[PDB]
């Protein structure tokens, strides 16, 4: 009979859930544009290590990324990727870490491939700051810093980095949390 009354109801419910998705996406899509960094440095924050830990040694989760931080309002768009448990040459062994270039909107004008320092380093919120770190150079030959195709290329990085136990049994993890710092260049990079 009044079958219309539900017809509308039903119409109202999805359009409704729609917003509960949009209004939702605008949630995570509020940190990026809030944890954003345009100078070249950046701090990837990670709470819930133990949890993050397991999910990784497990299989469900194992490949975290980070706030797309750029090297200046209209420049490169790079990012990091942690592997708590570790992969490639250290899956079980210990924590691995990588740098990475996404695809940008201004990314077109930029000179390719990449070529800038990157002191990605694990901090240390202990009381002495003896936080492990390291940087390298983008090698044109090996495909990983050349002008982007998809949205993010072969996350290049220095596998073996902070080793499990040394990281787990130390002064690096605090309140089940740790901070990472990648250091890209910029100078030897003609500003806009």
């Amino acid at each position: 009979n009044t079958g219309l009354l539900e017809s509308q109801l039903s119409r109202h419910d999805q359009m409704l859930s729609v917003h509960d998705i949009r209004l939702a996406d605008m949630d995570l899509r509020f940190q990026v544009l809030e944890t954003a960094s345009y100078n070249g440095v950046l701090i990837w924050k990670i709470r819930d290590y133990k949890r993050r830990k397991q999910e990784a040694v497990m299989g469900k989760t194992l490949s975290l990324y980070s706030q797309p931080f750029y090297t200046g309002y209209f420049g490169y768009k790079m990012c990091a990727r942690v592997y708590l448990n570790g992969d490639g040459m250290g899956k079980g062994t210990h924590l691995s870490l990588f740098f990475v270039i996404m695809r940008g909107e201004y990314d077109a004008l930029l000179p390719w491939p990449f070529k800038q320092k990157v002191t990605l380093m694990l901090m240390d919120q202990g009381s002495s700051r003896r936080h492990l770190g390291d940087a390298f150079k983008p090698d044109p030959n090996s495909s990983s810093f050349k002008k982007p195709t998809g949205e993010m290329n072969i996350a290049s990085g220095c596998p073996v980095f902070v080793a499990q136990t040394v990281l787990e049994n130390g002064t690096y993890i605090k309140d089940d949390t740790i901070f990472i710092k990648v250091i890209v260049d910029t100078s030897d990079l003609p500003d806009p």
Partner: peptide, 24 residues
């Protein structure tokens, strides 16, 4: 001292080279 290895996303063993030695 040497860096610049690569993405270990499970699968391809490399074009006959990939690795990384450290953690020491």
């Amino acid at each position: 001292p040497y860096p610049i290895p690569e993405e270990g996303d499970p699968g391809p063993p490399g074009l006959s080279t990939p690795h990384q030695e450290d953690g020491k």
